[PDB]
Design a protein around this ligand. Structure first.
Ligand code: TES
Length: 250
C-alpha cells in the first residue's frame, strides 16, 4: 500500500478555529488580532504535524525547530489557499470557519494587495487541477524549502530529507502517467507553483514585521509565540540571512 501517502493523510491537521466575533463590525485592529491568534493556534498544529512527518526526526533537534520557524508562513498560506479552493472555490480567503475574508475584509485588513496574491494562489489549485495528494506532498516539501545561507547544524541530513520528498512528489506524478512527457510537464507545473509561494510569504513577512513594530500604536495584539518568531526569526529572512530554495531561477 501507499505508505508515504498513508502517513501524510493520517497526520494532516483538522480544522482550526480563530475565535473571531463575527457579530462585531469589521475593523483593522479586530481582524488582525484575530489573524494573529489564528497564527498562534495554527503554529501548535504545524509543530505537531511537522514532528510526525516521515524522516523528520533524522534532523538535528535545533534544525527541526529552525525549519518550522522559517517555513510556517509559506506552509500556512499554502494550506489556507487549499482550504479556500475546496470550500469556496477561491471566491474568498478561508482563513478559518469563523474567519472568512470577503473583499470588504481584505480592504479593512489593510492587506488587500497581499490578499490578492493569496487568492491568486488559491485559484491555481483549480486552474492546475491539483489533487488532494499532490497538495499533501507539496505542502510537506514547503517545510524543507527555506534555510540559512550559511547552512543548518547538520545540513547533510536536511539535504537527504529534501531529496526524498522531491522523489515522493515525482512518484505521485507518475502513479497515473505512462508517457514521460506528461510527467515532466506536471513536475514543471508543480515546482513552478511551489516557487510562487515564496514571494507571497515574503510580502506577508514584511507586513507582519512592520505591524509588530507598530503594534502598540494601532491596537493590534500579538500572542507570545508570534511576537517571538516575528522579532527573532522573520528578520533573518528579511535581512537575507535565511533564504528560500527555488526550483527555477527567478
Ligand atoms: C502574520 C499574520 C497572522 C497569521 C496569518 C498571516 C496571513 C496568512 C495566515 C494564514 C492562515 O490560515 C493562518 C494565519 C496566518 C499565518 C497574517 C499576516 C499579518 C498577520 O500578522
Amino acid at each position: 500500500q501507499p505508505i508515504f501517502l498513508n502517513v501524510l493523510e493520517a497526520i494532516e491537521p483538522g480544522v482550526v478555529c480563530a475565535g473571531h466575533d463575527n457579530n462585531q463590525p469589521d475593523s483593522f485592529a479586530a481582524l488582525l488580532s484575530s489573524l494573529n491568534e489564528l497564527g498562534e493556534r495554527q503554529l501548535v498544529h504545524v509543530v505537531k504535524w511537522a514532528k510526525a512527518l516521515p524522516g523528520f526526526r533524522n534532523l538535528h533537534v535545533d534544525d527541526q525547530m529552525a525549519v518550522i520557524q522559517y517555513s510556517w508562513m509559506g506552509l500556512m498560506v499554502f494550506a489556507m489557499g487549499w482550504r479556500s479552493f475546496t470550500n469556496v472555490n477561491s471566491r474568498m480567503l478561508y482563513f478559518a470557519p469563523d474567519l472568512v475574508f470577503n473583499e470588504y475584509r481584505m480592504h479593512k485588513s489593510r492587506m488587500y494587495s497581499q490578499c490578492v496574491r493569496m487568492r491568486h494562489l488559491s485559484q491555481e489549485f483549480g486552474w492546475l487541477q491539483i489533487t488532494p495528494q499532490e497538495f499533501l506532498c507539496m505542502k510537506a516539501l514547503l517545510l524543507f524549502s527555506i534555510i540559512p545561507v550559511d547552512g543548518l547544524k547538520n545540513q547533510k541530513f536536511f539535504d537527504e530529507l529534501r531529496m526524498n520528498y522531491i522523489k515522493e512528489l515525482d512518484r505521485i506524478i507518475a502513479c497515473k502517467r505512462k508517457n514521460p512527457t506528461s510527467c515532466s510537464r506536471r513536475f514543471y507545473q508543480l515546482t513552478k507553483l511551489l516557487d510562487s509561494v515564496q514571494p507571497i510569504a515574503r510580502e506577508l513577512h514584511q507586513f507582519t514585521f512592520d505591524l509588530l513594530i507598530k503594534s502598540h500604536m494601532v491596537s493590534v495584539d500579538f500572542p507570545e509565540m508570534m511576537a517571538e518568531i516575528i522579532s527573532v526569526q522573520v528578520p533573518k529572512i528579511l535581512s537575507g540571512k535565511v533564504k528560500p530554495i527555488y526550483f527555477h531561477t527567478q
